[PDB]
Write a protein that binds this DNA or RNA. Structure first.
Ligand SMILES: [Mg+2]
Ligand SMILES: [Zn+2]
Length: 134
DNA sequence: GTACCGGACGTTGC
DNA sequence: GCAACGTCCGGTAC
């Protein structure tokens, strides 16, 4: 399908085959009207190791939106197992208040473990901010 | 190499 | 109310 982001109607872009590391592409709209994109990769150092979803594509996207003050965003990833239950329950925490970010798993995704979902999830950030690690 | 630990948030089962 | 459970993660004990 095609998802709306401001005035744009964007579909899923080409992503590398899932090798074991989840790679994703994140789209937003700049303070002018143009469409910008950034690639996020699983792993890497995170400022919140106390949140199990901070190392994921959805968590890195949420933290990016919080840092750069982005209100709307749209991310596509390539993980066939879907979006983990952590990213389901803690994204709105990580996300700044009233920020809208939809996470689109690859089409045809099949969850395996508990909490993982294969459908699109539209998160709405809550007034809660992430707890400091120390 | 395998096997756990662990913060943290909401869900499910009891 | 409480126990298990969820990583795309590192880190620690065998
Ligand atoms: Mg929040
Ligand atoms: Zn996740």
């Amino acid at each position: 399908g095609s998802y709306a982001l401001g005035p744009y109607q964007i579909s899923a872009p080409q992503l590398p085959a899932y090798n074991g590391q989840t790679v994703g592409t994140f789209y937003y709209v700049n303070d002018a009207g143009g469409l910008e994109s950034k690639v996020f990769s699983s792993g890497g150092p995170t400022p919140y190791p106390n949140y199990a979803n901070a190392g994921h594509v959805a968590g890195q996207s949420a933290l990016f939106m919080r840092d750069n003050g982005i209100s709307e965003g749209l991310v596509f990833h390539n993980n066939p197992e879907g979006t983990c239950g952590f990213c389901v329950n803690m994204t709105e925490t990580l996300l700044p208040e009233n920020a809208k970010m939809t996470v689109v798993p690859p089409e045809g995704a099949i969850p395996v473990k508990r909490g993982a979902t294969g459908e699109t999830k539209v998160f709405t950030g809550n007034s809660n901010s992430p707890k400091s690690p120390h």
